[PDB]
Design a protein around this ligand. Structure first.
Ligand SMILES: NC(=O)C1=CN([C@@H]2O[C@H](COP(=O)(O)OP(=O)(O)OC[C@H]3O[C@@H](n4cnc5c(N)ncnc54)[C@H](OP(=O)(O)O)[C@@H]3O)[C@@H](O)[C@H]2O)C=CC1
Ligand code: SF4
Ligand SMILES: [Zn+2]
Lengths: 108, 347, 162, 95, 28, 180, 180
């Protein structure tokens, strides 16, 4: 099945039905998942870690994301739009993978 | 010259590169007896061309050290614990292998292993294990020229019985049958030299009448490569004799000449006497461990195999069928090793 | 296009003062001492075109550019993957020398170098780049011209309507 | 007469000429005057007229089994072109 | 004998790092 | 061939995966030469691997007739070869050896067959001979009948038109997006 | 097309292309002042087959190629100037490769044929160059098409041609066959 499926993105930091940018690594071996290509075990993947973390509520229409708590010990400062975000469909920090959502746009 | 492919199924897909150390050859080989004199050169030839060689060895890290250099990263796989009686280990060793070469043999008996075990039981069990797999495409067995079922010596008789068993289980196996192999690590010239120099008297069975066809190690290794590069060779036995046939007296004389020995130290220990001096010592060997003091030469089996003419049969396959010209073992690079010792201008 | 007016001035002046003695084609290749099979390889003398992502003209043959832009490149040969680590393995000695270091100001310079070493070469001229805007949008004024929909029809005027 | 027999004889006919040259003027006259009649006589025969600025005028006929005979047509009048084509047909008959 | 590259003989699922999928002929 | 149609006994497919099914009599011996496995390869008794346009230095002519040439961006895969070399090797094997033995010799043969092929990168003007051709084919154009078809494109789906596009996953996604 | 509109400097190249060249008129500057934004006001997908060109036209990576996403950097790629066989236009392209893999295809300037524009099929069909590839000669048997060497395939073709004679041999050329 996976041999003839179109590579797709789940949509956490992307959209539900988009193409996934893919290189040809693992195509001969027969591996078609991102984590399978570099991890050969059966342990929990870092993607499994990041999904387990829950979205965090913030006030405002923009949140400053430094990745870590200290600005100089993490990702570059990033400003994420909170417009059109809810718990089910949160905004994502591209560097860290943290998820955010706000109710301010609904005048709350 | 045009490089010829290794005639293995689906090799054309996997193979890529010029054919060197870093190139990819589609040959994965399990060479039993890799650390031995014959096995090391076969491993060198296969691994030199970018192929992967699995070398099962009885635990000895210093003995298998040269095999580490033979190939690039991950090409020479050294398996630590090899036992001829362990089936599961043999299956694991040949798991990924598409060619298997068996160079496992004993020159002398001990208490742990006899001729019948190593030369008969191991070939049959390994033959069954290779046959059940199906992935293995080529099988090569190395045997002596003089091996025959109707042979006085037990070694050369058990070897022929094991070869027949292999031919029965695998019909497409090739039986390589070289003569006395000359090399830097050989047991032919080295034993003759040690006999001439560090032994009180050099006993020669009869007068050296027995004829032999010694061959150089590089020639046998190239013959192995030519066997693997042709599928038409399968199912055939090749008698890899040397270019020149020599009696043992000529070889002893020429060693004495090259070494510039003062005179002839060889004595006439005729047959029917070695058969009485060494006959109890064989039973001595079968109940004691391996001892450097006495071995190989000082056995009735050696005397029995030195009273016959170990020469290729007239109608037979040989180096010409493989398009190889064997190099003379009495001149050139082959004879350099004994030459370095003394040439009369040396020391 | 005017002048660099820097070290390149002395570079060009050293170029014009000095000259090289003529030798038969291919003779220098024997003096080089490299394997003679190197000269069996074929040569392409070309100038790289502009990358479509960027709008800079430095890499192109433009009067702005003062750097050598004509490369000698050799044909691509076999490449495979390392069985252990999947690295790209090669046996081509001349893989990156031409792209990296063989840069020439003029096509004749690269042709002279190839003929001096004995390499057979094919020169590919870059597709000419002319900075000519089309007649529809020749200038900023043309954006708001009457060409868009014609002269405004005045049949809607109340006087013309009545 | 002989114009009917090109199909039976030739598998293909090639007319190479230069687009604008003094040497190929006769070839151009030949192609712009007799190509229609030759095609009318031999409908299914491929008569290929191929041209380039630096091209050298020639008349090539391919016979059965890939045998090709090339005849140079440079600086020859349109009538001479026709005679040379007739000679090509006769040569094809000889085979 | 714990860590080896994924292209090693020891690796359970040995990797041939081929970047192209090969056509499989239809059966029979 | 046109005068007396003959049921083909051996069909050579030079990268043709879009052939009409009636083209092969279904008892013919089919040799497929190409670089993707598709309808052509499925119906082949012998498949000969060939390089793609990214893997070979080859000549193509435009709709305007301008001759342009490809370069070898990436090396050939597996036990595949350049297509003209495959055909010349087969010619030697079958007993009709072809004169050329190198790529420049092939280019010279192309120049002999058509002089414009020597002028790579330049479009050559065509003499206006179209009227004389139609005067030549007077009887044939009369032979041609009328069909109950309307002038329209033959491209059903733009994203998939050749074997490379059909293999492409991205083109399949584009087609799915358009067809929803 | 992948979008990161946060990186968008408000040039109007994408809008001007979509209007003047592509002619689908889908993109516009919606908004006033600093919060002005570029894109379709509704949720719409860019329909032109020239859609890929906005990615090259975008100076600051706000519009990017989704198939070629996070796969390589520019300095890693070797570019070879070749032509596109997707159609008979013969668009001049630059194929960027890392090792043995083609990573992306972008146009080149040729005012004669393709000013600097490339169609989406030509731009994104490199994906199908990694799939369903033929690597080895295949000769048919009772078990189907099976691996064979070049000599064996040529022998089978020789045995087949021996039977056929004259017009029984037939050749069909494909869309991507070259002149040689
Ligand atoms: N003069 C020659 O060299 C000739 C050799 N041959 C034949 O070639 C074969 C080997 O040649 P050669 O290499 O010279 O012999 P060697 O004894 O030099 O090589 C023997 C190999 O077999 C291994 N071996 C022996 N017994 C056992 C065992 N019971 N279990 C596991 N491994 C074992 C040894 O490993 P370890 O070192 O741990 O014992 C060694 O690696 C022999 O059968 C010989 O008859 C053929 C013609 C002439
Ligand atoms: S071309 Fe790029 S930067 Fe310019 S408006 Fe469009 S998306 Fe923004
Ligand atoms: Zn962050």
């Amino acid at each position: 099945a996976e041999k003839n499926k179109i590579p797709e993105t789940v949509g956490g930091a992307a959209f539900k039905g988009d193409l996934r940018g893919t290189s040809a690594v693992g195509l001969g071996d027969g591996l078609y998942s991102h984590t399978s290509k570099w991890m050969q075990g059966n342990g929990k993947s870092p993607m499994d870690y990041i999904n387990e973390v829950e979205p965090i509520k913030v006030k405002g229409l923009v949140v400053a994301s430094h990745g870590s708590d200290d600005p100089a010990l993490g990702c570059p400062v990033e400003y994420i739009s909170l417009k059109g975000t809810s718990y089910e469909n949160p905004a994502v920090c591209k560097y860290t993978g943290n998820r955010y959502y706000s109710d301010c746009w609904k005048h709350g | 010259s045009t490089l010829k492919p290794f005639d293995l199924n689906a090799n054309n897909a996997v193979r890529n590169g010029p054919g060197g150390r870093s190139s990819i050859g589609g040959v994965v080989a399990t060479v039993f007896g890799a650390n031995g004199f014959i096995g090391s050169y076969v491993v060198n030839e296969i691994s030199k061309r970018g192929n992967q060689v699995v070398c099962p060895y009885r635990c000895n890290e210093n003995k298998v050290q040269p095999l580490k250099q033979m190939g690039d990263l991950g090409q020479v796989v050294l398996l630590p614990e090899f036992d001829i009686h362990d089936d599961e280990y043999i299956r694991r060793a040949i798991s990924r292998s598409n060619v298997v070469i068996n160079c496992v043999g004993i020159r002398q008996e001990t208490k742990n292993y006899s001729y019948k075990d190593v030369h008969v039981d191991f070939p049959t069990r390994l033959a069954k294990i290779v046959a059940e797999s199906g992935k293995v495409e080529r099988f090569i067995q190395v045997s002596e020229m003089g091996a025959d079922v109707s042979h006085a010596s037990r070694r050369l008789q058990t070897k022929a019985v094991g070869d027949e068993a292999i031919m029965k289980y695998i019909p497409d196996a090739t039986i390589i049958r070289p003569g006395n192999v000359v090399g830097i690590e050989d047991y032919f010239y080295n034993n003759l030299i040690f006999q001439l120099s560090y032994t009180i008297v050099a006993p020669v069975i009869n007068n050296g009448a027995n004829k032999v066809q010694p061959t150089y190690i590089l020639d046998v290794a190239d013959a192995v490569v030519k066997i693997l590069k042709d599928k038409k060779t399968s199912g055939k036995t090749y008698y890899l004799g040397g270019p020149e046939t020599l009696t043992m007296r000529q070889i002893y004389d020429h060693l004495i000449d090259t070494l510039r020995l003062s005179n002839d130290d060889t004595v006439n220990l005729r047959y029917e006497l070695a058969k009485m001096l060494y006959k109890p010592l064989d039973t001595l060997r079968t109940k004691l461990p391996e001892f450097p003091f006495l071995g190989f030469m000082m056995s009735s089996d050696y005397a029995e195999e030195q009273v016959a003419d170990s020469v290729a049969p007239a109608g037979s396959l040989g180096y010409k069928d493989l398009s190889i010209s064997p190099a003379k073992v009495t001149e050139g690079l082959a004879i350099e090793g004994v030459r370095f010792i003394r040439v009369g201008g040396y020391d | 296009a005017t002048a660099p007016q820097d070290f390149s001035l002395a570079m060009k002046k050293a170029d014009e003062i000095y000259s090289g003695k003529t030798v038969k084609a291919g003779d220098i290749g024997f003096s080089a001492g490299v394997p003679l099979e190197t000269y069996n390889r074929k040569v392409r003398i070309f100038c790289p075109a502009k990358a479509a992502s960027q709008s800079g003209l430095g890499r192109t043959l433009h009067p702005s550019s003062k750097a050598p832009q004509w490369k000698i490149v050799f044909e691509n040969l076999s490449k495979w993957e390392n069985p252990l680590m999947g690295w790209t393995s090669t046996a081509d000695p001349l893989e990156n020398v031409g792209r990296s270091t063989l840069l020439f100001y003029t096509k004749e310079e690269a042709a002279a170098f190839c003929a001096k070493h004995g390499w057979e070469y094919v020169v590919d001229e870059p597709n000419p780049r002319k900075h000519i805007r089309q007649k529809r949008y020749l200038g900023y004024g043309d954006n708001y011209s009457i060409k868009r929909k014609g002269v405004p029809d005045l049949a809607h005027l109340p006087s013309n309507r009545s | 007469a002989w114009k009917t027999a090109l199909t039976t004889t030739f598998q293909e006919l090639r007319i190479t000429l230069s687009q604008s040259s003094s040497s190929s003027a006769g070839a151009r006259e030949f192609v712009l005057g007799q190509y229609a009649e030759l095609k009318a006589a031999n409908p299914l025969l491929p008569i290929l007229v191929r041209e380039s600025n630096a091209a050298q005028a020639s008349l090539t006929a391919r016979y059965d089994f890939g045998v090709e005979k090339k005849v140079s047509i440079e600086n020859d009048s349109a009538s001479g072109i026709l005679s040379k084509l007739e000679g090509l047909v006769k040569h094809g008959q000889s085979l | 004998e714990c860590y080896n590259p994924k292209g090693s003989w020891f690796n359970p699922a040995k990797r041939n790092w081929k970047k192209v999928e090969i056509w499989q002929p239809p059966q029979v | 061939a046109r005068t007396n149609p003959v049921p083909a006994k051996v069909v050579y497919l030079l990268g043709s995966d879009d052939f009409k099914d009636e083209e092969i009599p279904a008892d013919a011996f089919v040799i497929y030469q190409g670089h993707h496995g598709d309808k052509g390869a499925a119906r082949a008794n012998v498949v000969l691997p060939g390089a793609a346009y990214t893997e070979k230095a080859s000549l193509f002519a435009n709709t305007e007739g301008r001759v342009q040439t490809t370069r070898t961006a990436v090396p050939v895969l597996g036990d595949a070869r350049e297509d003209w070399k495959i055909i010349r090797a087969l010619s030697e094997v079958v007993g009709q050896q072809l004169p050329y033995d190198s790529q420049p010799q092939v280019r010279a043969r192309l120049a002999e067959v058509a002089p414009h092929f020597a002028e790579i990168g330049k479009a050559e003007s065509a003499l206006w001979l179209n009227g004389q051709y139609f005067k030549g084919v007077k009887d044939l154009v009369a032979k041609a009948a009328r069909s109950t078809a309307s002038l329209a494109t033959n491209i059903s789906n733009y994203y998939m038109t050749d074997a490379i596009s059909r293999a492409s996953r991205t083109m399949a996604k584009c087609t799915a997006v358009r067809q929803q | 097309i992948k979008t990161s509109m946060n990186r968008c400097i408000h040039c109007t190249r994408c809008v001007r292309f979509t209007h003047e060249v592509a002619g689908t008129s889908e993109l516009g500057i919606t908004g006033r002042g600093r919060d002005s934004e570029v894109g379709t006001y509704i949720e719409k997908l860019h329909s032109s087959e020239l859609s890929g060109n906005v990615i090259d036209l975008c100076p600051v990576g706000a519009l990017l190629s989704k198939p070629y996403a996070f796969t390589a950097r520019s300095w890693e790629l070797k570019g070879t100037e070749t032509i596109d066989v997707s159609d008979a236009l013969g668009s001049n392209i630059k194929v960027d490769c890392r090792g043995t893999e083609v990573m992306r295809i972008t146009p080149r300037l040729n005012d004669a044929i393709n000013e600097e524009w490339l169609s989406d099929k030509g731009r994104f069909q490199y994906d199908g160059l990694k799939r369903q590839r033929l690597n080895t000669p295949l000769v048919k048997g009772a078990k189907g098409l099976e691996n064979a060497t070049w000599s064996a395939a040529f022998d089978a073709i020789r045995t087949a041609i021996a039977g056929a004679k004259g017009n029984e041999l037939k050749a069909i050329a494909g869309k991507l066959a070259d002149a040689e």
